[PDB]
Amino acid sequence: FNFNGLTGTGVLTESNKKFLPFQQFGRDIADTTDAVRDPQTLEILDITPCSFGGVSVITPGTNTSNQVAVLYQGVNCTEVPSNVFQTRAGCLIGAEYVNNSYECDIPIGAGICASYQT
Amino acid sequence: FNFNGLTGTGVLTESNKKFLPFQQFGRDIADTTDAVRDPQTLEILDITP
Amino acid sequence: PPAYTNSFTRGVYYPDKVFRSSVLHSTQDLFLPFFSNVTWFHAIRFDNPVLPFNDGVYFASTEKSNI
Amino acid sequence: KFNGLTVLPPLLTDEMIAQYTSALLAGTI
Amino acid sequence: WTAGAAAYYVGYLQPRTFLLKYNENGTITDAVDCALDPLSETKCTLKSFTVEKGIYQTSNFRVQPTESIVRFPNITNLCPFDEVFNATRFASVYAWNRKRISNCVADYSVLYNFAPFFAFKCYGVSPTKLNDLCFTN
Amino acid sequence: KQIYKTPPIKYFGGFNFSQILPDPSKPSKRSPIEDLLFNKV
Amino acid sequence: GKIQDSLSALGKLQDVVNHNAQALNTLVKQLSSKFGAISSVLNDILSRLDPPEAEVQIDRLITGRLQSLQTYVTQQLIRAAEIRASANLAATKM
Amino acid sequence: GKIQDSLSALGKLQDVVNHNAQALNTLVKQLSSKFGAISSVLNDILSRLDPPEAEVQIDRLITGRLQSLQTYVTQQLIRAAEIRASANLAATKM
Amino acid sequence: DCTMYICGDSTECSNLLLQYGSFCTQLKRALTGIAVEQDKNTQEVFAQV
Ligand SMILES: *[C@@H]1O[C@H](CO)[C@@H](O[C@@H]2O[C@H](CO)[C@@H](O)[C@H](O)[C@H]2NC(C)=O)[C@H](O)[C@H]1NC(C)=O
Ligand SMILES: *[C@@H]1O[C@H](CO)[C@@H](O[C@@H]2O[C@H](CO)[C@@H](O)[C@H](O)[C@H]2NC(C)=O)[C@H](O)[C@H]1NC(C)=O
Ligand SMILES: *[C@@H]1O[C@H](CO)[C@@H](O[C@@H]2O[C@H](CO)[C@@H](O)[C@H](O)[C@H]2NC(C)=O)[C@H](O)[C@H]1NC(C)=O
Ligand SMILES: *[C@@H]1O[C@H](CO)[C@@H](O[C@@H]2O[C@H](CO)[C@@H](O)[C@H](O)[C@H]2NC(C)=O)[C@H](O)[C@H]1NC(C)=O
Ligand SMILES: *[C@@H]1O[C@H](CO)[C@@H](O)[C@H](O)[C@H]1NC(C)=O
Ligand SMILES: *[C@@H]1O[C@H](CO)[C@@H](O)[C@H](O)[C@H]1NC(C)=O
Ligand SMILES: *[C@@H]1O[C@H](CO)[C@@H](O)[C@H](O)[C@H]1NC(C)=O
Ligand SMILES: *[C@@H]1O[C@H](CO)[C@@H](O)[C@H](O)[C@H]1NC(C)=O
Ligand SMILES: *[C@@H]1O[C@H](CO)[C@@H](O)[C@H](O)[C@H]1NC(C)=O
């Protein structure tokens, strides 16, 4: 998007902020633009960030297997692009979540683990 | 010494490495030149500090 | 009509004229990507096309004659 | 969240820590 | 006229990161493409060929701008640049002519169609990227 | 302060400490377990 | 029973939260520092300036922000040694 | 007697070796960086450039590599405090 | 994220950042090193049963 000079990237959504007739855009704490006013229609729109985070690969070692599962940290499983499991720590893909319990093997975070169980 | 562009200092000694006919010089782990091939005589020489 | 072929691990070339011993070196250059779709032309009736270049060309051929 | 900054979750939840503490209490008493 | 049976395979090179493995004699025996799936990307991140068990914070990610809008000014006249570029008489340098430009749509196509241009030096901008910025005054 | 030595007999009421005392048949005079410890790093 | 009255103290736990929050708030704020650059935002420069000129500008903004990351990581290592020494004391008392 | 079987563990000792080897391998590799200069070799600069401009290019490389040494020495001091704390624990147990 | 903190979205920047040696990767590694120890700290205090 570009709003009369403001160049950026993000998702545009209906806002609930109220600008003073002379203001064009707003910024949040830490001084980053978080709302704009459309020059043509004069409506206030929020700008939310395009999802991100690190990507890590979980591997048992090529001398055990070549399978792998991937956890996208605090990414919803609907905004990533079998076994898909949503946890409070992110989106876990490639492992099935069970209700049993074993000893930690490969820590995944927040109480969850994984291993090459048959 | 200067070996066709490679500028440096050191002692030249007979090597026991084998370069592939298209390679001029070699580097060691940590990315430093450790062997060259003499452009004129085509012999591989180690460079020690 | 086109006809494709999976190139598994092909077109890996020596990036520079530097000898290296038992060393895993990480380079970044123009390479043909792994497990890709190369195009399998015949040109034999006689129809050879004028192809683009765009960044290099990997060109394989299997011919016992000299054509 | 910020411009490339992220906070990772702990491996142990606070429920699991509470279970270690109750085990120490039950063992001792 | 008459030929045999030709066949050739054509593929195109792309800018990629590889991890090549040179053995003792300086030959390449194996390579890993650091953008294929996930285990070869992990092996190229670690700079190793053996990956022990655990999460390996490999790459990163971030969805991509789908389309692209451009809400701009309303329209307006044109701010006539030919008032300042085609006046019959220019004032001398001790009392130099000044003009403020009001709001308009500023086509710089004109102002290019004038002369062989002995000097054309922008400083805070570049003339190839002049038709996208929007200055206030 | 001082460098202590064990007596030649080396028989302490049964307890057998040969795996932690030096091996006289070695140039280094390490113990059997110390030889493993320097072979892993 | 009197222990609850003394609670309804934990300043040592709030200080850990504060120190990290302050380093993350400072790290983000250091991006609005021209550091000696026409603009303090990247795209503007890399999009209102040629391709060989913007070089100098962005090169000026990279060294400054790279120094910011070195400051941040060095302090996290020094501060993590202090919480580690505290965790060792807590484990020993346990 | 079972102790040998469990050995034939020492990862804490290998980590000390690894951390120093990695800092020495990185310190050397940081010499092949241009830091935004025309070249990365202080002789090649002169060979293809006049002094007035060569002093600037060499000063950039000097600043970059001097920053490398400051990073190296700061980390050795922070890491030496950790091995010192470990040596104090080992002496106390002794 | 070293690349997203410094450059930020821009792609002309990424080729320039690759100049500054590995100053970037070292940073990431140190930060993650502070990540593995923080979970071990907790296990040593509480997981004694
Ligand atoms: C920009 O110009 C347009 C006309 O080209 C103005 O347009 C109309 O806006 C009203 C208000 O929403 C609509 O009800 C009409 O349907 C629009 N006309 C057409 C033909 O679609 C617009 O208001 C101007 N905006 C500004 C900021 O100047
Ligand atoms: C470059 O020219 C020199 C000429 O001196 C070559 O050196 C001679 O090579 C022959 C062939 O092996 C030897 O028999 C002579 O003894 C060499 N001369 C001396 C003085 O030693 C040299 O081989 C040439 N290099 C290449 C790559 O062609
Ligand atoms: C600059 O001014 C001159 C005259 O003021 C313009 O010349 C006129 O051009 C139109 C169309 O080409 C003709 O119909 C007139 O007869 C011309 N006038 C004269 C006196 O010759 C010229 O077009 C202007 N240039 C620009 C770029 O605005
Ligand atoms: C102390 O223990 C060692 C073994 O750890 C004994 O030495 C072994 O004795 C057996 C017979 O009991 C022999 O078969 C082995 O060859 C011996 N090993 C070596 C390295 O010599 C030793 O005899 C024990 N000492 C006493 C006093 O019982
Ligand atoms: C690794 O592979 C070797 C054979 O090459 C095998 O002997 C060994 O058990 C393997 N290690 C593991 C952990 O599977
Ligand atoms: C992901 O989005 C769906 C709605 O599309 C929602 O139901 C779900 O709770 C979300 N998951 C998380 C972890 O927020
Ligand atoms: C695990 O148990 C919960 C109830 O505690 C249940 O809702 C859930 O479906 C169970 N999960 C599976 C995979 O069976
Ligand atoms: C090659 O082509 C086939 C069919 O056109 C397609 O299914 C396959 O995904 C292609 N390979 C790649 C690597 O895209
Ligand atoms: C290539 O390496 C092998 C060992 O892998 C060795 O036996 C052989 O002699 C080498 N070839 C040359 C020409 O040195």
What is the SS3 string spanning chain E?
Answer: CCCCCCCEEEECCEEEEEEEEECCCCCEEEEEECCCCCHHHHHHHHCCCCCCCEEECCCEEECCCCCCCCECCCCCCCCCCHHHHCCCCCCCCCCCCCCCCCCCCCCCCCCCCCCCCCCCCCCCCCHHHCCCCCCCC
- Return the DSSP state at A8: -
8 A C-beta contact, residue E118 and residue E88: no
Distance CA A67, CA A116 (A): 9
Residue H56's identity, in one-letter code, is: V
Resolution in A: 3.2
Distance CA A55, CA A72 (A): 6
The shortest CB-CB distance from C41 to any of E10, E34, E35 is to E10
- Return the DSSP state at A53: E
Whole-number Å distance, alpha carbon H36 to ligand 3 midpoint, is 51
> For chain H, what's the residue count?
94
Say how many C-beta atoms besides its own lie within 10 A of residue H45's C-beta: 20
The shortest CB-CB distance from C27 to any of E5, E6, E20 is to E20
Whole-number Å distance, alpha carbon A10 to ligand 6 midpoint, is 19
Tell me the chain E residues in contact with residue I22 when contact means C-beta distances shorter than 8 Å. none
B21 lines ligand 2 (CB under 6 A): no
Residue showing tokens 């004069």: A42
8 A C-beta contact, residue F17 and residue F11: no
Strand B25-27 and strand C18-19: the pairing is parallel
Residue A65's identity, in one-letter code, is: S
Q: What are the CA-CA distances from residue E28 to residues A25, B17, E19 (Å)?
A: 57, 16, 10
Radius of gyration of chain G, Cα coordinates, nearest whole angstrom: 22
3 state DSSP class of G77: helix
How many CA atoms within 13 Å lie on the side-chain side of E120?
A: 11
Tell me the chain I residues in contact with residue H71 when contact means C-beta distances shorter than 8 Å. 26
Q: To 5 degrees, how large is the angle CA E124–CA E128–CA E134? A: 60
Ligand 2 pocket, mutate which of B22, B40, B43 (most atoms under 8 A from CB): B40
What is the SS3 string spanning chain I?
Answer: CHHHHHCCCCCHHHHHHCCCCCHHHHHHHHHHHHHHHHHHHHHHHHCCC
Distance CA A78, CA A83 (A): 14
Say how many C-beta atoms besides its own lie within 10 A of residue C27's C-beta: 14
Technique behind the model: cryo-EM
Residue in chain G lying closest to E131 (CA): G48
- Return the DSSP state at E71: B
Whole-number Å distance, alpha carbon B47 to ligand 9 midpoint, is 23
End-to-end CA distance of chain B: 13
3 state DSSP class of E97: coil
Residue H86's identity, in one-letter code, is: S
Helix axis angle, G11-29 relative to G53-93, nearest 10°?
A: 170
Which value, to the nearest 10 degrees, does the dihedral of the CA atoms of residues H61, H63, H67, H70 take?
120
Distance CA E58, CA E45 (A): 6
Residue whose CA is closest, atom 7 of ligand 5? A63
Those residues with Cβ within 8 angstroms of residue B22's Cβ, 6 or more apart along the chain or in another chain: C14, C17
Distance CA A115, CA A100 (A): 13
Q: How far off is chain D from A108, nearest CA to CA, in Å?
A: 7
Cross-strand partners of A109? A112
Distance CA A74, CA D7 (A): 9
- Return the DSSP state at E64: -
φ/ψ of residue G22, rounded to 5: -70, -35
3 state DSSP class of G83: helix
* Closest C-alpha among E3, G29, D20, C62 to residue A28: G29
Say how many C-beta atoms besides its own lie within 10 A of residue G54's C-beta: 23
Residue whose CA is closest, atom 10 of ligand 9? E25
φ/ψ of residue C17, rounded to 5: -90, 70
Give the pair of three-digit tokens for residue F20. 């932690």
Say how many C-beta atoms besides its own lie within 10 A of residue A45's C-beta: 20
Q: What is the DSSP string of H30-68?
A: TTS--TTSS-S-TTHHHHTS-HHHHHHHHHHHHHHHHHH
Q: How far off is chain I from H55, nearest CA to CA, in Å?
A: 20
Tell me the chain A residues in contact with residue I4 when contact means C-beta distances shorter than 8 Å. 52
Distance CA E86, CA C34 (A): 61
Contact between B32 and H28 using a beta-carbon 8 Å cutoff = yes
Residue showing tokens 């070249």: H39
E82 lines ligand 3 (CB under 6 A): yes
- Return the DSSP state at A30: T
